[PDB]
Design a binder for this molecule. Structure first.
Ligand SMILES: [Ca+2]
Ligand SMILES: [Ca+2]
Ligand SMILES: [Ca+2]
Lengths: 737, 146
């Protein structure tokens, strides 16, 4: 008779009553039906104030709050932030910035400022750098939310100076070389950005630092339909002056292999706006042109084609590519012939076949652009340097968990990245719960982590990455031989299956040696493995490497699968994780309320999918291992005093709750009396509520049995308070003489 | 440095300083409660005492910090004189017995809300020898009751 939540294709869940049949106000699988909150009209700032903490009740709560334009809700110290799609008045007001200062979490309403203030507070007290990890898909409000964290920190604990607006000025430079259009987003970030705000020994702001990770290298040469290379390429081709256009031999992006093909994409204008921003930054025409030269150089590189000639094998450049080669050699400051030899031979001179030279061309292109991006981020960092610092507070932004109808190596790496970030998310929430419980005077939270899914991927010798390397090292590498090696080595693995066992009909036609399913934290993903072997290899041979290092162009000299893409990805992912693990962590989860960028529309099923992809569902499950519901004494006083005799209602909130639990005989395993709240094991807040609503007479009786205890509690309270006052008086006199 | 039972008893006493139950006390609540029981600390005396244990340095101390603030190197049965002093806070006319009227005064000073009969009940409960009032022996027995 209790209203439950059940699946609803467009709202995720709807109210109603192996599987189960549900009547709304329909067959459903048992484990997809959740207890609902009794009061559907209600609203809490911390979802841990609910009686049931699950994906359904969570979704319902933040919805209710969304309507009241309450976009920020907590789950413990985790912030959920739903994009309003309009400017909610005065919430990012400077006044509000002062009202959040030094305020403990949950003495103010939920807000990114509080997340931000808390990081500073812990930094200052614990003397430990801090990280704020943001999740969210495209259009989730992630960019704005980052601004607020930085704005808040700077006006609150900066010194008049203005590092945020500085970082805000510099950002257009990052976006040019680091963002590109994807199928789901016209301006997606393709690297990991850790924007650090640094602090001196006395916790005052003194500078910024953009740490960067894992630029997506494959995009530099190849993109899928609906995708493009990095913005800069197209901007330059559409916006450069007729002059620059001539020096760099530019032209339509359609004239470059490296640039696949959209009206709303204003490359011409964004190029102008980009230069405008470059100047505000102090970027003169000289280094501007130096940047554009390498960009063009890479574009021409990519145009060099090859063919077999029969030349006492080895291949050669198509004569049609002569121009691309001289242009490229010219822009990269290389000798046209040196370059040519090094693109078609390797060093003992091994000739290269067509495919191998293609890979040499692309390997050079990827390294050059990647070093260019390194340089670009370094110049951005120079727009707001500092001499030294003690600690920082950084906001981490990096592509989230993702899947499509077709998943390749790109999704594999990205999802592997989020699998390790999720492990980190879980560990730190577990830690927070444990320290919350200790702080409250109460316990190890039951949780099995996803270490096994991580090990499937990265374990030495037998991990998928190492099996992939192994394939690259074989005389005739094969995707199919690789895929089968993966299945045969993880025989009865919880986390791996063949595509034939997919929960989707679209995947069940894929052969055992054409794919595999990984059970990721967010759900099963089916990867098609064609090209995994090719995509794992982007190595640049030493002679071609030497060549670029010894460029006539001084700028380039300064930029500078034996080692596979997969392995470098792991190495880099681990450096980012090293940095995070050295900080105290907080989390913000941004939510896109719907596709159309429209206000006051709440796509249930679509926000639910995001909750899952962000690992929130994973975190709630983790919280079921401890005390997921907690309520202040005052709050419980308010809710339940009406069910008890007037005698109890005279007590203060803490003693009222004390009395209640003593009289009900509530065991101290399932119900925990903290310093500020009562903490409940799963189900137990609800049980306590039922008891409270039962036979008022038997209830008043139980209270009678507690009368001696209550009187002795009243005495001891004032007696020990008198003793406290006397000790405090003796302490003052102690500290004097 | 305290028993499990002393920590428990002080924990409930802390709720008289921390009325709104946010788990933290400032100079204001410290001062208010001390004066209500007949002490007269200076603002500077309270600050100096708080700064000495306030880790955050926001001027708001929590329960374990409260305990530390109360701790000091103590003489033999100084604690006992402390308990006798606590008793004299209740026994306002200094005749050695706490009456209803006197308990009421303390309850009132500390902001406790109860009926005249409830005060009488409290007296009756700690009044072992039934002379209608609470002496020192009974006081301490009530105070350390389980
Ligand atoms: Ca208080
Ligand atoms: Ca007396
Ligand atoms: Ca007596």
């Amino acid at each position: 008779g209790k209203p439950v939540w059940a699946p609803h294709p467009t709202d995720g869940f709807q109210v109603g009553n192996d599987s189960l049949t549900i009547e709304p106000l329909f067959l459903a699988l048992i484990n997809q039906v959740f207890p609902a909150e009794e009061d559907s009209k209600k609203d809490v700032e911390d979802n841990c104030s609910l009686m049931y903490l699950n994906e359904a009740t969570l979704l319902h709560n933040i919805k209710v709050r969304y309507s009241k334009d309450r976009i920020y809700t907590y789950v413990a110290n985790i912030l959920i932030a739903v994009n309003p799609y309009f400017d909610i008045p005065k919430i990012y007001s400077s006044e509000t910035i002062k009202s959040y200062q030094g305020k403990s979490l949950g003495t103010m309403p939920p807000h990114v400022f509080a997340i931000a203030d808390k990081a500073f507070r812990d930094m200052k007290v614990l003397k430990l750098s801090q990280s704020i990890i943001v999740s969210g898909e495209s259009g989730a409000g992630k960019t704005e939310n980052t601004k607020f964290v930085l704005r808040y920190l700077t006006e609150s604990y900066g010194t008049g100076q203005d590092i945020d607006d500085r970082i805000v000025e510099a950002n257009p430079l990052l976006e040019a070389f680091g963002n590109a259009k994807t199928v789901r987003n016209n301006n997606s970030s393709r690297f990991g950005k850790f924007v650090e705000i640094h602090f001196n020994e006395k916790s005052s702001v003194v500078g910024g630092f953009v740490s960067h990770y894992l630029l997506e290298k494959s995009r530099i040469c190849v993109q899928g339909k609906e995708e493009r290379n990095y913005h800069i390429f197209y901007r330059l081709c559409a916006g450069a002056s007729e002059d620059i256009r001539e020096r760099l031999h530019l032209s339509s992006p359609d004239n470059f292999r490296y640039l696949n093909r959209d009206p709303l994409l204003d490359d011409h204008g964004d190029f102008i706006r980009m230069c405008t921003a470059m100047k505000k930054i102090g970027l003169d025409d000289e280094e501007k042109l130096d940047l554009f030269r390498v960009v063009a150089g890479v574009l021409h590189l990519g145009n060099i084609d090859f063919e077999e000639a029969g030349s006492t094998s080895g291949c050669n450049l198509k004569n049609k590519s002569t121009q691309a080669l001289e242009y490229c050699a010219e822009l990269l400051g290389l000798d046209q012939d040196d370059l040519r030899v090094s693109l078609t031979t390797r060093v003992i001179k091994v000739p290269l076949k067509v495919e191998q030279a293609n890979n040499a061309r692309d390997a050079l292109a990827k390294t050059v652009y990647s070093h260019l991006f390194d340089h670009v981020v370094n110049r951005v960092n120079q727009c707001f340097p500092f001499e030294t610092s003690s600690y920082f507070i950084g906001v981490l932004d990096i592509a989230g968990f993702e899947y499509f109808e077709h998943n390749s190596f790109e999704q594999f790496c990205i999802n592997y990245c989020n699998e390790k970030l999720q492990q980190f998310f879980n560990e730190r929430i577990l830690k927070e719960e444990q320290e919350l419980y200790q702080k409250e005077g109460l316990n190890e939270v039951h949780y099995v982590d996803n270490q096994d899914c991580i090990d499937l991927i990265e374990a030495r010798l037998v991990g998928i990455l190492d099996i992939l390397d192994e394939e690259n090292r074989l005389p005739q590498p094969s995707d199919q031989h690789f895929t089968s090696a993966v299945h045969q080595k993880h025989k009865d693995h919880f986390r791996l299956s063949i595509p034939r066992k997919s929960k989707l009909a679209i995947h069940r036609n894929i052969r055992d040696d054409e794919g595999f399913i990984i059970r990721h934290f967010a759900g099963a993903v089916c990867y098609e493995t064609t090209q995994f072997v090719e995509k794992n290899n982007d190595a640049l041979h030493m002679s071609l490497e030497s060549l670029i290092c010894e460029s006539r162009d001084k700028f380039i000299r300064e930029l500078f699968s034996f080692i596979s893409v997969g392995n470098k990805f792991k190495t880099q992912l681990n450096l980012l994780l090293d940095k995070l693990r050295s900080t105290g962590a907080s989390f913000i989860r941004c939510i896109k309320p719907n596709l159309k960028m429209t206000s006051h529309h709440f796509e249930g099923a679509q926000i639910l999918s995001q909750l899952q992809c962000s690992g929130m569902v994973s975190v709630l499950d983790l919280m079921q291992g401890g005390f997921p519901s907690r309520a202040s004494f005052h709050e419980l006083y308010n809710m339940y005093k009406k069910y008890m005799p007037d005698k109890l209602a005279r007590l203060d909130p803490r003693l009222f709750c004390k009395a209640l639990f003593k009289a009900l005989g509530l065991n101290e395993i399932d119900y925990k009396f903290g310093l500020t709240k009562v903490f409940f094991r799963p189900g137990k807040f609800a049980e306590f509520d039922q008891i409270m609503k039962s036979d008022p007479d038997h209830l008043a009786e139980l209270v009678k049995r507690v009368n001696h205890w209550l009187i002795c509690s009243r005495w001891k309270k004032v007696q020990w308070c008198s003793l406290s006052v006397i000790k405090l008086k003796n302490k003052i006199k102690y500290r004097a003489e | 440095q305290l028993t499990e039972e002393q920590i428990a008893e002080f924990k409930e006493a802390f709720s008289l300083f921390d009325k709104d139950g946010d788990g933290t006390i400032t100079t204001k609540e410290l001062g208010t409660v001390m004066r209500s029981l007949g002490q007269n600390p200076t603002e500077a005396e309270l600050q100096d005492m708080i700064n000495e244990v306030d880790a955050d340095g926001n001027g708001t101390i929590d329960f374990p910090e409260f305990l530390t603030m109360m701790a000091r190197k103590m003489k033999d049965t100084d604690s006992e004189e402390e308990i006798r002093e606590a008793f004299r806070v209740f026994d306002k006319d200094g005749n050695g017995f706490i009456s209803a009227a006197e308990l009421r005064h303390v309850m009132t000073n500390l902001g406790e809300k109860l009926t005249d009969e409830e005060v009488d009940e409290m007296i009756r409960e700690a009044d072992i020898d039934g002379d209608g009032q609470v002496n020192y022996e009974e006081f301490v027995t009530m105070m350390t009751s389980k």
